[PDB]
Structures are given as structure tokens and as C-alpha cells.
Amino acid sequence: AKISPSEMSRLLEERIAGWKEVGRVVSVGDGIARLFGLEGVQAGELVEFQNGMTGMALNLETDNVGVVIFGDDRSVLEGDSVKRTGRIVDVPIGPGLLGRVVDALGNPIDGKGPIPAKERRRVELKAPGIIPRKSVHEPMMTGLKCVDALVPVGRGQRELIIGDRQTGKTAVAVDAIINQKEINDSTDDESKKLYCIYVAVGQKRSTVAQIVKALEQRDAMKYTTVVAATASEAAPLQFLAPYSGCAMGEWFRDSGRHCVIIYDDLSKQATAYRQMSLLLRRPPGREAYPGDVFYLHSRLLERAAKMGDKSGGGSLTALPVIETQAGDVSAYIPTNVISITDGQIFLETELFYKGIRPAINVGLSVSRVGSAAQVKAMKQVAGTMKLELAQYREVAAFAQFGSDLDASTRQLLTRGTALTELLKQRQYSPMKNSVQVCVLYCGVKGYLDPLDPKEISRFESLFIDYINANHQDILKTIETEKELSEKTEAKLRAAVDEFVAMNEFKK
Amino acid sequence: SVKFMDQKRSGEETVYFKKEDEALLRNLLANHPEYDPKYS
Amino acid sequence: LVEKLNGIQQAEKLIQGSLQDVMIREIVSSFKDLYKSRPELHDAAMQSAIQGLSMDPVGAHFKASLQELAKVNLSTATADPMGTVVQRVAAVFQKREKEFLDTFTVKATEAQEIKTIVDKCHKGNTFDFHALSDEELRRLEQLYSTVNNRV
Amino acid sequence: QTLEGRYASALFRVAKKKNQLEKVYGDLESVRNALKDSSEFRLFVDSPAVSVQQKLDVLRQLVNRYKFDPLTGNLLTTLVENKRLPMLARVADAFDAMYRKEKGEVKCLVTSAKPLSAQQQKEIVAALQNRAGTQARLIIDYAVSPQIMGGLVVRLGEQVLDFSVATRLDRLQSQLLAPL
Amino acid sequence: IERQSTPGKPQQIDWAKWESQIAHKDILNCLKTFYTNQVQILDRALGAL
Amino acid sequence: NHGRITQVIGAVVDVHFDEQLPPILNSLEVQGHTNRLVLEVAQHLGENTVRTIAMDATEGLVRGQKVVDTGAPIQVPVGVETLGRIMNVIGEPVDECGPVPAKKTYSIHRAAPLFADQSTEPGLLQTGIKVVDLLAPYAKGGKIGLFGGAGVGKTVLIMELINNVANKHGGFSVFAGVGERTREGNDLYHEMMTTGVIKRKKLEDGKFDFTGSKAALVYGQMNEPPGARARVALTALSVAEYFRDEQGQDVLLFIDNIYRFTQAGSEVSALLGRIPSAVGYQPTLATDLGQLQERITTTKKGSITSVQAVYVPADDLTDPAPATTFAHLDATTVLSRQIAELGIYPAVDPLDSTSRMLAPEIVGQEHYDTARATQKLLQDYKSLQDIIAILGMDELSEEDKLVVSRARKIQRFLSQPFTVAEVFTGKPGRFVELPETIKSAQTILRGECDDLPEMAFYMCGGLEEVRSKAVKMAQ
Amino acid sequence: TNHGRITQVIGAVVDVHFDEQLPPILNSLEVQGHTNRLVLEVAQHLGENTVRTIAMDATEGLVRGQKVVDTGAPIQVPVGVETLGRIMNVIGEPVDECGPVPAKKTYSIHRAAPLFADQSTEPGLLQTGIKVVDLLAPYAKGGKIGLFGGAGVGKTVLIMELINNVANKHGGFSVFAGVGERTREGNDLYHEMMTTGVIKRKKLEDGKFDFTGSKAALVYGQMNEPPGARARVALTALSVAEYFRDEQGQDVLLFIDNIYRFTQAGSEVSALLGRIPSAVGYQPTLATDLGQLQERITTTKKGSITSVQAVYVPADDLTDPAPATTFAHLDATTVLSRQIAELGIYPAVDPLDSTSRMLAPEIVGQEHYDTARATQKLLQDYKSLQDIIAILGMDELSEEDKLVVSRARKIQRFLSQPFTVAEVFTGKPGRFVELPETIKSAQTILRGECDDLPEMAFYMCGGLEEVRSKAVKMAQEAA
């Protein structure tokens, strides 16, 4: 800081001296300006007006130049002078963003201090090529059970979370973020810590504040950052926020570290791009979108990658989110984003109201990476679980008509109901991998078939407390070895038997 | 109606042919002992 | 303590912001008056532009007012619409600083009240105990919960 | 660039090549002044009730009855053939604003009220040493927002030197409201 | 207990920053004095128990 | 600054200034005109030309008329003097009771509150309605949406919420009508003057004294141009922002047919020269709405609870306007025609309805479990509609028949006769507390009311009324 | 060399002004003064010595008045045995990080198709080792093959299996073209080809490399690249293959992944190039732009190119204009379905949508033709009982209909087989089923000499021996 009289006045006196390329505004409307001049402009560079507002030059026509404004157009007055800075639009990167909330351009909005970061990065960049990459072999612990078992996620993947409104899309990502605080606290190896970036496009600031509050309540902000391009924020900011997030994540990807980025409401980006192109008089396509939507999302999602041992070994995982209307996934945007991703996580309202929460349909949901992004101990259980759930999904529709079936089919129905009641979870209540392994072991080896379904919701909880109280060694062994030897098998079976002996349920 | 009929059909066929495959697995090795590896 | 220092830093920042805001506004209004009042500035600006086609009174007056302000010690000044820009700006300065210190410091009236009416009436050499008092001890407790929760 | 820009460039080029510059130069000023003073030639140009033949006939009568070159007549015949006669004034403005350019520029300029012969001389000589264009035929105007300090536009578009009071004042204020 | 022994001591505020970033430097000093006077007695009770 | 009209296209006016242009959003007054025609600048086009939208009819304008720039945007008065008073978009009162003697005026256009100046504290409202109190709890200090077509009971639902909240509120309140019927506007005005929400008193000298009023009114109705329909919600929001910024009070804000705010833009952008989007909507369909919604937010100074009625054209919830509006709401209530055709009122679809204040960390676990069990039951009943329509209930098993019975019973039990419906229903109103609803739902799910008939739950409120009606029907 | 000046820039479209000697259409222009190499392809002539071109790389950083140089010829890709074992871009530049291509020749990617007088050859049978393919949709040795399907049905997996089962045994060369597919997939294909000897990279002490052998060439225009590259990379790979066809007279294989991206990359720019959109957003020049490609892919009296194109089908809609037009350009067809993949029947080939010009009694004998048609009749008969089964039930069906349903289900499970590249999904080993074995097994199953066997003995097998073994195992485990 500084003092007014002796310092600031001297500074302004030193500031006032001035006399005698540049351009002038010719047309203004709807957050977009059309200039005449600046023949040496780079397509895509920042532009500064004579009132502090900023802009980005996109349409370098012959007569005029098309700039999109980062704010309101009340400042521009059709004749204002305009100057080019020469900088391509760029954002800061570093660990100074961790714990902070910033707009699309790196300007903070938490209201507590500036951004201490010295190195910047260009927004639009070339993705890495075929050679500086490697296969996906490490898992990304989501904290959920159905995901971590049947729809695994790796480090370097690009997995879509597609569903309807109010189905549990943001909650999946927030649980993925919350599950990492234990993994990060129990280490000081940055190669193993997982940092996080949450890009909120189109959301309202109340929602973003609620998410920040939910993370601060759980100490899940010292390894995350947020990029809020809300609805009041102009279309170019909603357009640039995901690319700013990818720029912030490429620091982790390139510096040997790992990262995960969640683009929330990725359709608002396409809405904003439609808006910009239609106000820049570019011609539309079908549903009024342009043709550059594929090049809009491919640019963004191809920056997620798993680099080789020569480029550090980092990663940048992506988890975009999409809201469909009436479950129509035959549309243009869902189809585009599905055709450029390594998996799918479908979410349904029928399953959301039937009682299945998270409401993940494990039939349509897939993961092309699959078991490579999955632990052996979890493979052993999840294979059987997927088979049993497939059989249950096949048979239950015919079974529900009150027909009378044999015991080999009654067992299928019982085990499927048990697993379906196991995979339910509370919001913001993630679980460790070893605990998921133990619970799914209890569910798969038949310690829930005779038990009542409605009781499982406490059979789980109590069992968890039991194995967190008296059997920490099993969890530590599973966490370290990442497999189930016969010793751990027998110990877990004995622990489950002791628990069922010590406790009593309705069956 | 569509997923309804499809899943009902699939379940009914699965149950029927599961029963039939159980019966055939019971009565296979008798009528075809040349395949039974128990006798080889 | 950390939240206290964040708050005081933000307050100082907004103080200096509003200060420079008014410092510019008042100089501008003063020049808009002086120009329309004085005849000489017109031909001076004419000559300035003419010689510029190959200092102006605007920059001259601005720099003059800034230099006259830089060594004022705004604490020593007068009321709000007191004419001279220093007398126009130091009112805002002092008032804002008072509304600041009253929010990140205790007030001497609050001090004097209890110092002279509550505490020493109990006892002297050590100020031993407190059963010798009225119900307003509870109010003193509330005062505690104000003071430490503002400081 | 624009339509009138194209026609003005063609006329500038051809008159720099074959006939002369001064004839067409004086012609463009006379035509613009006739348009801006008669108050009926403008409607004659804009109205569509006038047939193309009557248009060409009146244009040839103006050719004969006034000091007039064949290049400007061919220009007018082309603008009539292409339905661009309403673009006369615009074409004239473009031809006067790069340009009308080898001999001497015409510039706009503003004050508050009547200045004096002394500072008028000073203004013209200063703008002349700045231009280094030996011929300058200017304009006077009166707009009082820029309080008295002399603002103008030497007509080439990319030089609007805003020597004014209120403009420098507002630019300075908006500059010094910057943070720190 | 686990909470108040997991991070250990990441707070450890540094007055070198705030003495510079603040212009008053009259109440900051007394506040810092209070802080350093309380932390001494805290560590005292800690090592005493 | 003076300007001239050069061109006129419906609700759009192109103006030409000579010396100095006005900024965007600035107001211009037309002089050679009968009424007070106001134009709001929207764009700049070059040649010192400006494009503007008119707050009234352009019949009578001339290419050459004179226009005066006011130098600032539209200014609406604020204070406790606007209370108990109607005000059009330009602030001019149309109550025929005198002028507005308010000291201060605010601009129609203001930037939204920042990120740091927000406070998302979870509260609840006591609406007295069973469906919303159970399955879609309303958030004190948040946004609430009533989505519906034509003839499903949005206006009736808003009037019931007014009766059950604003009178029992104490603080201030505002009502905006954006392209709704003048009949219902006058009806609301007279109901407020009856119930004491508006306290008009005629002094001996013709003046009036609205001291004691607790509700402002802003009306831009169907008999208005689009420019006078796309700027009324902003007026109402300014009137409420004055309260919840300076006075620090918590306010309510009921808005009727916010969809017109977009419809006007749809019948304006074609004349402003913009390319249409999918269904003729604008490219700014999201920003023009978010700049309105982000001004509605609880902050550290005060609070705005908001209740917006959102039209749904052609009963299509996939339209871009409601699709965008869904993202800005904290609570939702989607009305349906299929349920209204069954005579159920309010015709709320409890599955399309949702909320953020349903989690067990806000409402109890008994409330959460009852709500989720009801939703499961209604979804299981919906899943059998096809097979019931084709084959019939006889094909079903006994568990499915019990499910269907309980689902029909809880459908008929989630129906309430309001007080404002007494004029076309006859039956008196029934306020319903939350624990009675929860007990009734628990009992209906358990099976303590399977003996009763199905038509005994229709328009009865609690369960004692249902049992009394079953008794009387036994005869 | 001429010299031009950029006039305006709109996305992937660049207008350029020349003072004299305009370039013909499709010529290549190089931008001067840019960070990396930037090439433009002329697409239209607008007037006033102005042209309109499409950029191969991103236009970010371009300036009006920037200088441009015409090359006097379209995008020339290098050719020879030096491209073998190596990856290439749309403009021929390598992206394998192993050095530059020391090719002694270059071919223009834009050429004219072979005329009608250059006839095809006999319909040679192609053995892939896949059962449903070898049986119902035999692939031709010298003709085009199509793999139509949406997302998640096994297109790139099927292409990888075909590569493992064909390219390694093939004595001639081979080409792969990735047109807007995933980069993970490109890396995996490159690693697997380096593993299985299809590529033989040998690093040297002096820092160079040696790709001797390595009967494969790779070309990539992946999603990250802009339009203009995705469109022309197919022409690049097709010229690389036409070289081996015409001059060396070799037989060539040509695998293409997501040819649909070509059309998409046209539709991305047509409206910027001033064209009016077609029915559902596609460009008007869809059929001609696709036929100019496809007609260059054909057998002649100098060589042969067997092509295999994967066609994305959005939303499982075969009525879309792109696949609708592509169907007419193919000799062999293979349509993948989701309703079949949901049953775990992989490969998820629909035998009632798959067709082939080769399935005729004169080419394949009547033992094959009648067997295939009987299989299709059986499957259609099974499909024509789904509603009766869903409404009434199996109780109403006669024993003839129950036999039909059983045999159809057995055929359905039997056409499945495990691939070698799906070990990391299924864990099971891969199989290679010859065609006589397939015909014997199908004839046996249709004749009724396996009704004694169960149904679950088929869903992972490659013959009847494995079926009997699995049934034997299930019977032993039953007691």
C-alpha cells in the first residue's frame, strides 16, 4: 500500500504528461463492437477501449473488425478510441489459484487479495500429439461405489456425465472432489496428489457460493480452484471459461503432477457460442447452432491427456456434464460430445425417484478404458457384480408379473436386489476404496441375500464402523498391496462372520 | 410398452431356456457318453 | 486475527479508492469553474493548441493542485464545502477515517463510561471481585463481547 | 473499397493519367456546391420519376453550359447506367477526403465563436508546416462543447487531432480514475 | 483430536507481510503484542502439562 | 441533446444526433407527440445514428420529429411512498390518486451484486399448501417457479400464496404483472384494499394517505408494446432493491408471466435487425434473463424471496425460454393439464416438481423419507399406466394393485380447495400445517387408510376430514 | 512464385488478394511470417483477383496484409517406401518425432478417378477369421467394405481385429487413415503395430532411425485438427495408396476410421464459404465430394485396393444423408446394432442389415448361399414371434416354433466370438474361425444335430468342438 498526499499525488503528477496503432468504434450493440482500423490485429487478440473495458477480436473483415466485449456495452459510444495490446488472450497458472475463485480471465472474485502468479498461458493452444502420450493405467477414485466398480475412471480420461435436470450431476463431481482430501493429506508427493478445477458455466452465483461453502465445510478447497462464468457474465466469458480451466490444468499436466477438471453446464458454452456467432452475423446451422461446435468441443477435450515418462508423467482428466431435454440423446450437442469421449455416465429421473441415488443407469453408462483404470481387488468383485446385475436387469421385468420361478432364478433376483440396495449412497458421503471393496465383498459372497433389503442401508453403515474400529489393518493392507490375497480374504470373511454374530437384523 | 414387451420377452425366454438347458445338461452325458470327459 | 487483518486491509483499500475518486472529482469541478470564470485561459489554450500543432492550462492546473495537495497533512483542515479542494477533500478523508476507526477500535466514550462508573467503584488496590455490583455487570459482560469481537 | 470509393479511385486514376487533374478538381467542387446550394438538383438526382433519358439530357446540357471535361461526363453516364446517381454527393465526399490530393486538401475545423485574423494565420501556417501540403482550403465551424480550444479534422480520416479542452479534460479524468 | 493434529501448523502468520501491506502500523503493533503474549502462555501450559 | 427521427418501424425508432451521441440504455423523450413517449437506446449504428425501443405506441410519429436526451436511463421513484401504489414502467402512477412524492429515484438498469456479497442460508416458508410443503419446500430468500400452460392455475396459486404469506409476513412486498389480464390486476388491487395490504385514505382536500401499506404494484399488461413489457420486471426489481439495500428489510416479489419479457424481445429483435435462433428466439435469450435473475438474490444486507410464474407455450417444457429459466431457480412447481382434467387442483406434478431444500440436512429425516417414498410410489404407479390402459388392472398382481390403490389415494389427498377458489368452487378453504400432512402421508403409505374409499380424499385437507367424509359416504 | 496478401479472416476461411497471376483452384498457399507452418487450400474464386482458401492449421495469430506464397500445385504428399512404418499429417509432415521423410517423390492428393475402361477384377474372397462376416457378408479382395455403427458397438475394435487377422498375413503394403478419431486410439494402434511387427523401428547410434520392413503407413487428421485437414487427410492417404497401386503394382489395404468426419468437416465451412445449407445442415456438395473420393478407391488392371471404412451413424439413424449416400458406394456392408450388443453378443453385427455383392451362388457355392439364406430366414422367423412371445408367452407356441426359437437363439449365440484385442475387456483368448468350419457348424445347427446341446455353450466359441466342450463343462459342474 501507500499514503495519499506525498506519494499518490506525486505519482499522478508524473502520470499526467502526454500529447500527440489506434482505431475508432463504428458500431456498437449487444456486447459486440465493430471497429474501423487496426490493420495489424491478430485474429483472437485482446483489445482495450478508453474506459477500462476489454474485448477480443475475432472477425477480421476487410472494412471493419469484429470485437466481442468482456462486459456491458454502455461504456462504448460509437467513436471511442481503441488500442491493441498485442497479447493473445491468456490466463495465469500456478498454485496461486488453489483455494481461490476467479472469473474466466483469472481476475479473482473471492474479494480477498490478488492472484500471486507470475507465469501466464495462452487460452487456445494445440493439444499434444500421438507420441507424447501413453496408455491409461492409474485409477481416479470417484468415491462412489457404482462408478468405482462398474464404470471406472482413469487419470487421463474424458468421461461424460449426461442426464436430465435435478438428477445428481453436480453431486457426483462434488463427491469426486471431496474424496481426494484424505488421499492428499496422507502424502506429500505431488505426483500422487490430485488437484481439481471446477468450471461453472451458466450457473448462478448462489449455486457457486453453495458449492464453495460445501467444500470449505470439508476442507476441500486447498487442492481445488473454481472458474465461475455465470449468466450475468457475458457470452465471451462463458465461452472462454472452460478453455481457461484447461489452461490452468495444463500446468499440472505438464509439470509431472495430476489434475481433474469438471466442466459444469457445458451446453451453456455452446449457447454462448451460438449467441456470439449470431450477433457477429455468422450464419447458423440446425437448431441455430454453427458448424464449428465439433471444433469447439474437440479443441477443449483433446487437451485432456496422459503424458509419457519423458514429459513428466502428468495427467489431466475431464468430466464434462450435459443436461438433456426429455431424455433426448439423439440431439446434436449430446451426440457430438458422446462421439468424442471415452465413456458415458447416464442419469435418469425414473431411477432417481425409484430410490436409486446416484441414479446411474449401468446399462447405457460405459467406460472404454474400463478395467485398466481399475484395481485388481475391485476387478474381482465388480466383474461378478456386473454379471449379476445384468442377469437381474434381464429377468426382473418378467419376474415382476407375479409368476413363480425356481430357486436358481430367485437367487438372481435376491442378489440383484441386494446389490441395487448396496449401490445407493448419501450425498457428500464418499467412501474409501478398501471400504468399497469390503462392502461389495459382503454383497457378492452372499451375506446380504437372506437379509432384508431395507436393512442393508444400516448393515453397510454399521459394518463400515466395525471395520474402521477393529480391522484397520485389513484396510491398510488393501490400500498398500492393492489386491486380495488369501490371507486378506480369510480375514475379511472372519470379520464379516464376527459382525453378523455380534449383530442381528430382520432376517 | 416397447422396453416393457422387450424385457418381458427376454425374461420369459431366459427362464424357459434356462430350464431347458438344465434338463439337457442333466440328460446329455447319458445319451452321449463319448463326450463325457469323466470316461476319458 | 487473520480475518481482522483482511478486513482492515480491505477497509484501507476502499478508503484510498474513495479518496482518489473525490480528489479527481473536485479538481475537475474546480477547473470547470475556473475556466469559465477566467478570460486568460481561453487564449492560453489557443496558443497551446497552436504550438502543439508542431504546457496547456489543464495539465498546468491539475499539476498545481496536486503539488499543493501533496504537502497538506489533511488531518489539519476544515469542513466539507469549504472551497479550496484541500478543504473539500480533507473533510471526506477525516470523516471516512473516523467511520473506520469507530469500527476497528473501541470508542473513548465507551471506555470512560465503564472506567469511571463501573470498575473502580468496586475496589482499589487490586480490583478484587465482583459480587459487589449491580445487575449491570451483565451489561459489562455484553460490552466485553462487543469489544473483543470488534478488535 | 465501397462503391463510391471504387468510382472515386477510378476517376482519380484516369484523371491522373490522361486529361488533367485541375479541370476535374474544380468540377467536383462546383458540382458539390451546386448540389448543396440549388436544393432542386438534389431532388432531381434522387427522384425516380425522372427518366434515364431526361437524366442524361440534363447532364449533357450541364456539360455544354458549364466548364466540363469528358471524364466527369462519362462518370455521370456510368452512374446513371448503374443507378448510382444518388451516390454523387458521397462520391464527391470520398474524392475530397482521401484525396482530391495532389494539389491541396480541404479540412474541417471548429471553434467557439469568430477568431481573429492573427490566430487564423497562426492556425493555417501551423497546419501547413504539419501537412507539408502546399495547398489547403479549409472550413470554419462553431460547436461549443469543446469549449474554445481548436479542434478540427484535416481530411484524411486517420488523423482527427482533438486539440480541445473538454476532450483532454475527460480523457485525463477517466485516466486518473485508474486504481493506484 | 485427529482434526487438530492432521494439518499440524499451516497457519503460522508472518507479520513481515502485514507491516508492509498496512499503513497504520499503530494498532497492528499492539495486536501482534497480544498475539505473541498469548502464544507464549499457550506453549507454557502445553509444555507444563 | 436534441435529435431527429429518421425512420420508424413498429416498436423501433431510428434517431439522428448532430453534435454528441447518447450512451446505450439512455432515455429519450419525444416532444411533438400527444402522450409522453419515451425511447430507450439499444444500439449504435454509425453516422451518429441510434436505435431505440419505444415504451408506448408509435402511431402519430413523423420522420423529422424532435427528440430530447435525458442524459440518464429511465428513473423510477423509490421510498416508502411507492408502497400501496401502482406504477407503470416509466414510474408514472396510473392509480388516479395523485403523484408519487418520493425523494429519491433509482435507475431501471443496475449491475447485479457481486460474488462475495451473497449469503445462501437455508430457510423454509409456510405456504399452507400440502404439495409444496411436502415434496417441494419453498426457500425463504430464494427463487420459486410455477411453470404451466394456459388454464392450470398459476394465477390462483399465486393468489393463494399471497393470501397465506404476504398477510402473515410483516415486511414489504411487490407484485409485477408482465402481460397479464387487467381484470386480475384490478382484482388483486381490490383484494389488497379489502384485506388491508393496501390502506388508502381520502383526505378532505382530495389528497390521499397510503401510510400503512405493505405492497407495491407494477403493471405492464397485454395492452402495451413490447418495449413496455420488456422493462417492467426491471422496474419492480429496482423498487425491491431499494428496500433490500437501504432499508435492509426482507421483501417478497411475485411476478406474473415473466415469459412476456422474452416474447417482447421476440417481437422486437426482428425489427432491430437480429438473426433469429431455433424457434425465432434471440441469441441473447440466456443473458437477457440472467441479467434479470442475478439481481434477485439474498445478500448480507437483505433478502428477496421471489415467486415467478413461467408460461409454457403449447405445453412444451423443452422450449428454450423455460429451459433456460429452469437453471436460475431454487424451487420448482410444474403444473400439468393431464392432472387438471382429473379435477385435481392444484394440478401439481410432484415428479417434475423439485427443490434444493428437501435434503435431510434441512428438513428432518422423517420428512425426507416420506417425500422419497411418495415419489417412489407415484413413479411405480406411472410405470404401470401403459399396461393398465391396454390390458387392465386385473392382469396386475396384488402388490401392484396395492401400489395403484395407494397412489390414487395419495394423488386425491394431494388436492386442496383454496379460499380464492370459493367463487367458482363453493367449498371453504383449508389451511394445512406440515406435520399433519406428514402424518397423513405416513399413514397412507403404511396402510392405515386402505379401508377408506378413493373419492374420500378429494378436497379434504387433513385426515379427520377424509374420515368424516368416508363416514358420511357410508350412508 | 506469385505473392498475395491476406485480406480478411473468418474462422477456417481466409480471403487472399493477388496483384497478378491468380492461382488455379485447389492450389496450396504458404503463409509467411507465422509461428509454425501454415498452408491454405484454394476453394473458390470470388472476383477482383481475390480467392478464398481453407487453412490446414489454426488461424489464431493471423494478420490482415500478411504475405502469402503460391506453390503452383496442390498439397503434395511424399511417397515411396520411405513413408512405410511412419506416421504422416494431412500435409505430409511427420508427427512421429523420428526425423523427416527422405522420399524421392511426391504425389498430389487431388487426382482424377480411373475411367470406366479400367475394369475391376474377379470377386476374390477375403478370409478374416470372423464367423458372421465370412458366412453372411463375405469381404471382397479388391472392393470396398463398410462398417456402419454409432458409438459403443465395436467399430475400431473390429478394425483392429481385421488388421491383426489380415494385415500381418498380407504380403503387400497397407495404409491407415484416422479421420477425426481419438488420439488415445491412435497411440494404441501405433503401439500395437510396433508390437506385432507391422512396424519395425530401429534407432541408430548416430541419432537416426531405420524403418526397414514395416509394411504399413499411417496418416492422421484427428479431432484436434481443424477443418481442411480432416477433409484432405483422406485424399492424402488415398494418394499414398494410389502410388503403391499404380507404380509398384502391389495389392494394397486401406483402413479408414470415421469417414463421416469428412462430411462434417465440409458442413463446418460450407456456410462460411457462402453455400446454402442442405436438408439437415449438411452441405450441397456431399454426393460429389464423396464420389470423387470413392471412385479413386477401386481395383484396376495394374493393382488393387481393398478398403475398409468405418461410418459413424449418429443416433443409430441409418436414414441420415451421409450413410444413405455412402451405402451406394460399397461392395460389402456390415451394420452394427445396440440391441444386439446389449445381449453381450460381440461382434454386434446385425445379419438382417448386413449385405454383400459377393453372396451369390456363382461366386460362393450353393452350400454357402443356401446356408446363409436359411440362417437369415430362421432369424427373421424368430423376429416375427417377438410380439407373440411378449404378449401371450412361450406356452402358446407350437413345438415347431419352439424349435425355431431355440435354433435362432443358438445361432445368435454362435455368431459371437472373442477377439484377440478384446482380452483387456473379456479376458478370454482370441479365435480364428475358418470358413469351412463356419459352414459346417451352421449346416449342423440348422440340420438339427445339436438340439441336445444347451444354449450357453455358444456365446464365446469359434466352432462346434468348443461348444461341445463348454456344454460338457457345464454338465460336469451341474453335478
PDB file of N, CA and C in Angstrom, chain E residues 4-20:
ATOM      1  N   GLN E   4      -7.282 -31.629  14.868  1.00  0.00           N
ATOM      2  CA  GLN E   4      -6.262 -30.724  15.378  1.00  0.00           C
ATOM      3  C   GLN E   4      -4.903 -31.389  15.511  1.00  0.00           C
ATOM      4  N   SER E   5      -4.676 -32.500  14.812  1.00  0.00           N
ATOM      5  CA  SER E   5      -3.312 -32.965  14.591  1.00  0.00           C
ATOM      6  C   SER E   5      -3.046 -33.417  13.158  1.00  0.00           C
ATOM      7  N   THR E   6      -3.987 -33.233  12.232  1.00  0.00           N
ATOM      8  CA  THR E   6      -3.736 -33.627  10.848  1.00  0.00           C
ATOM      9  C   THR E   6      -2.918 -32.584  10.083  1.00  0.00           C
ATOM     10  N   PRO E   7      -3.332 -31.313  10.024  1.00  0.00           N
ATOM     11  CA  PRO E   7      -2.501 -30.332   9.308  1.00  0.00           C
ATOM     12  C   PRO E   7      -1.250 -29.938  10.070  1.00  0.00           C
ATOM     13  N   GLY E   8      -1.269 -30.029  11.396  1.00  0.00           N
ATOM     14  CA  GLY E   8      -0.120 -29.688  12.209  1.00  0.00           C
ATOM     15  C   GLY E   8       0.019 -28.217  12.549  1.00  0.00           C
ATOM     16  N   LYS E   9       0.534 -27.422  11.608  1.00  0.00           N
ATOM     17  CA  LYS E   9       0.723 -25.996  11.845  1.00  0.00           C
ATOM     18  C   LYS E   9       0.883 -25.226  10.539  1.00  0.00           C
ATOM     19  N   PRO E  10      -0.164 -25.108   9.723  1.00  0.00           N
ATOM     20  CA  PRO E  10      -0.054 -24.365   8.463  1.00  0.00           C
ATOM     21  C   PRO E  10      -0.387 -22.882   8.553  1.00  0.00           C
ATOM     22  N   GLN E  11      -0.732 -22.373   9.736  1.00  0.00           N
ATOM     23  CA  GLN E  11      -1.247 -21.014   9.877  1.00  0.00           C
ATOM     24  C   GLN E  11      -0.116 -20.006  10.077  1.00  0.00           C
ATOM     25  N   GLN E  12       0.606 -20.126  11.195  1.00  0.00           N
ATOM     26  CA  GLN E  12       1.922 -19.524  11.399  1.00  0.00           C
ATOM     27  C   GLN E  12       2.094 -18.177  10.703  1.00  0.00           C
ATOM     28  N   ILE E  13       1.260 -17.201  11.066  1.00  0.00           N
ATOM     29  CA  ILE E  13       1.161 -15.966  10.297  1.00  0.00           C
ATOM     30  C   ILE E  13       2.473 -15.195  10.391  1.00  0.00           C
ATOM     31  N   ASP E  14       2.792 -14.457   9.329  1.00  0.00           N
ATOM     32  CA  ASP E  14       4.068 -13.758   9.202  1.00  0.00           C
ATOM     33  C   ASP E  14       3.787 -12.263   9.120  1.00  0.00           C
ATOM     34  N   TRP E  15       4.200 -11.524  10.152  1.00  0.00           N
ATOM     35  CA  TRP E  15       3.894 -10.101  10.235  1.00  0.00           C
ATOM     36  C   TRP E  15       4.721  -9.262   9.270  1.00  0.00           C
ATOM     37  N   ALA E  16       5.772  -9.831   8.676  1.00  0.00           N
ATOM     38  CA  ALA E  16       6.564  -9.090   7.701  1.00  0.00           C
ATOM     39  C   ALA E  16       5.700  -8.639   6.531  1.00  0.00           C
ATOM     40  N   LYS E  17       4.741  -9.475   6.132  1.00  0.00           N
ATOM     41  CA  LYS E  17       3.828  -9.111   5.054  1.00  0.00           C
ATOM     42  C   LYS E  17       2.917  -7.962   5.469  1.00  0.00           C
ATOM     43  N   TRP E  18       2.300  -8.066   6.648  1.00  0.00           N
ATOM     44  CA  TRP E  18       1.230  -7.142   7.001  1.00  0.00           C
ATOM     45  C   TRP E  18       1.765  -5.794   7.467  1.00  0.00           C
ATOM     46  N   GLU E  19       2.939  -5.770   8.104  1.00  0.00           N
ATOM     47  CA  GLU E  19       3.558  -4.493   8.442  1.00  0.00           C
ATOM     48  C   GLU E  19       3.787  -3.657   7.194  1.00  0.00           C
ATOM     49  N   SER E  20       4.103  -4.307   6.073  1.00  0.00           N
ATOM     50  CA  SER E  20       4.330  -3.581   4.831  1.00  0.00           C
ATOM     51  C   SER E  20       2.999  -3.238   4.178  1.00  0.00           C
TER      52      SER E  20
END
